[PDB]
Amino acid sequence: GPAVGIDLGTTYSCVGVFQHGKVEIIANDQGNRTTPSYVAFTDTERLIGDAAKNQVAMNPTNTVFDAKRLIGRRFDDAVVQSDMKHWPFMVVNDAGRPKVQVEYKGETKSFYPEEVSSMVLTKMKEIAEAYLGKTVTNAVVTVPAYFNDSQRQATKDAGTIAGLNVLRIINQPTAAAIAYGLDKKVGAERNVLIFDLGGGTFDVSILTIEDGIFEVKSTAGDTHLGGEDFDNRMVNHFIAEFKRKHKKDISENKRAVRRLRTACERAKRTLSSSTQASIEIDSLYEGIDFYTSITRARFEELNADLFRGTLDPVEKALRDAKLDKSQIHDIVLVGGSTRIPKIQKLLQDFFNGKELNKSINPDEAVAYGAAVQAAILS
Numbered sequence: 001g002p003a004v005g006i007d008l009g010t011t012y013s014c015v016g017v018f019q020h021g022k023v024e025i026i027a028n029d030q031g032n033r034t035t036p037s038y039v040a041f042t043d044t045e046r047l048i049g050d051a052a053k054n055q056v057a058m059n060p061t062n063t064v065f066d067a068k069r070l071i072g073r074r075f076d077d078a079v080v081q082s083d084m085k086h087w088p089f090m091v092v093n094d095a096g097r098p099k100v101q102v103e104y105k106g107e108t109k110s111f112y113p114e115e116v117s118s119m120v121l122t123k124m125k126e127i128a129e130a131y132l133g134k135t136v137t138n139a140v141v142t143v144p145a146y147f148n149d150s151q152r153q154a155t156k157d158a159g160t161i162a163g164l165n166v167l168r169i170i171n172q173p174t175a176a177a178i179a180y181g182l183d184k185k186v187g188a189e190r191n192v193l194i195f196d197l198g199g200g201t202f203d204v205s206i207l208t209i210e211d212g213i214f215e216v217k218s219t220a221g222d223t224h225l226g227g228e229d230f231d232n233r234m235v236n237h238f239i240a241e242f243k244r245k246h247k248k249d250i251s252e253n254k255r256a257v258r259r260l261r262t263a264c265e266r267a268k269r270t271l272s273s274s275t276q277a278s279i280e281i282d283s284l285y286e287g288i289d290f291y292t293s294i295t296r297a298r299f300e301e302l303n304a305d306l307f308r309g310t311l312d313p314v315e316k317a318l319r320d321a322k323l324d325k326s327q328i329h330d331i332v333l334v335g336g337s338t339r340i341p342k343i344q345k346l347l348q349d350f351f352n353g354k355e356l357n358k359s360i361n362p363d364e365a366v367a368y369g370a371a372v373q374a375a376i377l378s
């Protein structure tokens with residue numbers, strides 16, 4: 001069976017395979033080309049991917065996500081301490097190692113973060129296998145450039161327990177560059193900036209490629225800035241609107257909020273191609289159907305400060321790598337949030353009209369690159 005490339009993301013994962021000189025990003029059962037990094041446990045089953053995310057609103061304590069934030073980390077870790085204050089599922093301490101605790105089939109169980117990630121990895125494997133019609137064994141999995149030895153180990157382990165022979169763990173920025181062929185030798189040093197604005201993390205990496213050898217000169221970003229924050233701005237906006245028209249605050253009702261957030265995320269996606277989108281939610285609060293809409297203009301202004309602040313980490317990355325705007329040769333967009341028109345305008349204006357590399361869907365770029373690398377490695 002061919003070796004596959006797997007992008008194990010914080011919010012979404014994606015799998016691609018290199019066949020006949022072309023890379024194919026494989027779609028799941030629901031036809032999506034990316035699958036949520038979600039796992040859910042119920043009375044009767046274990047849900048993974050779309051099925052898991054599609055039921056979070058009613059099973060918050062038993063629906064796990066953000067496992068990538070825990071992987072390879074300790075319970076005492078300040079990061080873990082801060083983060084766990086925001087998850088509806090519980091994190092327990094098992095001899096210094098953090099574990100997620102859920103109720104599966106009425107019984108209480110706990111999993112190490114690598115076990116949860118292995119579940120998502122298993123889903124990608126069977127998605128590839130379904131498509132290929134053959135067993136998938138070898139794989140190249142990607143990881144952020146900033147992951148340390150423990151995090152890389154844990155990611156590798158998540159793979160082995162998923163029945164995957166991890167050929168190699170390569171950095172996400174490097175994978176993105178390989179997708180565009182920016183790794184080909186042109187007899188000269190090339191500086192490339194990877195702008196990765198995903199579902200929950202933002203990362204800016206500056207790579208220097210010489211003779212086909214990558215060198216991460218600098219990196220910057222924010223581990224808590226992503227498409228989720230954009231959705232939230234919309235949510236808070238609609239909560240206020242609902243209160244105006246119906247004099248009813250729905251903030252307390254967790255289900256109404258979660259359903260609204262789902263509708264916002266979807267509208268947001270439409271806003272990247274259309275200038276307006278409608279939100280049609282039946283019986284949002286009590287028996288009130290919430291029918292409304294948003295314009296791209298309004299969306300842009302709701303997140304103006306967030307979008308704009310995106311340039312700060314870019315300036316920082318530049319100065320650390322000791323380069324001027326003019327010195328970077330290529331700029332590649334990675335992450336689902338980069339499909340947002342305002343973000344593309346903003347970055348391009350910053351780089352004085354420089355063209356952006358974005359022919360490959362940004363949320364598929366890393367998987368795409370990993371597949372090519374998997375191919376050569378086999």
Ligand SMILES: Nc1ncnc2c1ncn2[C@@H]1O[C@H](COP(=O)(O)OP(=O)(O)O)[C@@H](O)[C@H]1O
Pocket residue numbers: 009010011012013034197198199200201226227228265268269270272334335336337338339340362363
């Ligand atoms: N058309 C789009 N416009 C804006 N955001 C989008 C669009 N398509 C996907 N997204 C967003 O991208 C994020 C997913 O990013 P992705 O790169 O797939 O994952 P990850 O950050 O997990 O690596 C989500 O916040 C999703 O709403």
Ligand SMILES: [Mg+2]
Pocket residue numbers: 009010198335366
């Ligand atoms: Mg990503």
